[PDB]
């Protein structure tokens, strides 16, 4: 193991193998209480966001939203082998909320669709 | 989108299309911290309750508890097309804890049943 953020300079592919390292380190007098409460709020906001998308129990959550190319026209080798996650985060910043909105909409349809599938005797 | 609680006056069916909106608004010196901690405790108590019922990652969760009629003898048209969630809340208030108890029991049985099925070679 490379330790907390040790994969930050690694490629996205290699960095995808250390997701539990950062996840563990997201949780692990007024000032002390405000900062630890804030850490809890940020954790819960991210978990709620994953929940809305149907990703509540996963670190690598594969969804049903297609990539629109305009967000980034790089191929899989250019992204996963020749870039770090920091570079990607910079490149995809302007499209982050668009993707998040689409993820929410996709999960909503799936839940409704599942509700209908479970209504067939 | 009508925004947070915009569907409050809509029918139960229509308001089901806004479940993600209210969820987002559940998370987003001493007085401020108590208000923030209280919001966190209420969120987590509701998520724990969904977890016990086996609904930890869903906004719409189907269960195996039958409707017992005494709780409400309205048909689906009256409940989903001619009522709001506030009216339903009031109508079903006296039976909410009964339903919650049954939901807990149902999940417990399913967990044991699942555990036994996974023990069959």
């Amino acid at each position, epitope marked *: 193991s490379l330790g907390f953020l040790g994969a930050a300079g690694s490629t996205m592919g290699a960095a995808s193998m250390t997701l539990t390292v950062q996840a563990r380190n997201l949780l692990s007098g007024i000032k002390q209480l405000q900062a630890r409460v804030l850490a809890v709020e940020h954790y819960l906001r991210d978990q709620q966001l994953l929940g809305i998308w149907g990703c509540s129990g996963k670190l690598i959550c594969c969804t049903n939203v297609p990539w629109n190319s305009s967000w980034s026209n790089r191929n899989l080798s250019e992204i996963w082998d020749n870039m770090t996650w920091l570079q990607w985060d910079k490149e995809i910043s302007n499209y982050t909320q668009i993707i998040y909105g689409l993820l929410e909409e996709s999960q909503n349809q799936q839940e409704k669709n599942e*509700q*209908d599938l*479970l209504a067939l005797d | 989108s009508l925004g947070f609680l915009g569907a409050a006056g809509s029918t139960m069916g229509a308001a089901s299309m806004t479940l993600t909106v209210q969820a987002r608004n559940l998370l987003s010196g001493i007085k401020q911290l108590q208000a923030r901690v209280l919001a966190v405790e209420h969120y987590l108590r509701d998520q724990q309750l969904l977890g016990i019922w086996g609904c930890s990652g869903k906004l719409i969760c189907c269960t195996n508890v039958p409707w017992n009629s005494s709780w409400s003898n309205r*048909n*689906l*048209s009256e409940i989903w097309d001619n009522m709001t969630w506030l009216q339903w809340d009031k109508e079903i208030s006296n039976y909410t804890q009964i339903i919650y108890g049954l939901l807990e029991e149902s999940q417990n049985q399913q967990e044991k049943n699942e555990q036994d099925l996974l023990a069959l070679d």
Partner: antibody
Amino acid sequence: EVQLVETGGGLVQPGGSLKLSCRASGYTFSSFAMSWVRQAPGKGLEWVSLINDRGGLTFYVDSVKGRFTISRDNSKNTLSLQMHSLRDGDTAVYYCATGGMSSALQSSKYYFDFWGQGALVTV
Amino acid sequence: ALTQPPSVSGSPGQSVTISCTGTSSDIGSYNYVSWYQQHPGKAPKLMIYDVTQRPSGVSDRFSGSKSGNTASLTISGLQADDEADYYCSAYAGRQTFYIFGGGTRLTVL
């Protein structure tokens, strides 16, 4: 008050691709699931396909599962069936109908309450 | 498909019953057996839905029932306008949704 009008081609050579579009009026289109039912000139009725009210879910009879696509446009009140391969055994009068399913919060259907005039498709 | 009599008959005013026989996974398990009346040259009209229900606009003379794996439609008070091809259908499940039977020709003597 409820009307269903089926418009489409009546002749296709084998291996052809055709489309049939059933336009509905007199009821809320988006509130009902709809299906297509086939009847060969000398046979009884056969169920072919079923689509939900939203269009997200589609079901097909095994005989056409890999060759027919069912879709609906809820703003134009139109249900369309796109046929591919169109093998001889698919010569029949096709009918569009409402019913056959409900979206979980509605009373059940499992029946076809409204039928169109139908259209004859010759392979 | 479901098995139905090729044809039935009776005198005007007589009660005529059309039956359809399926298996335990079809008519038996699912109590959703509908009936349709198809005049020659016309689209089928819905007459019965569910085992015992009838759409509004359909005369009280058309009724039916289910016993075991056998479903039936009884048309009392047979009228000249009742001459038609009758079909039953049933929900069969999620892999196969609907099964239609053979048509029954109802003729008025």
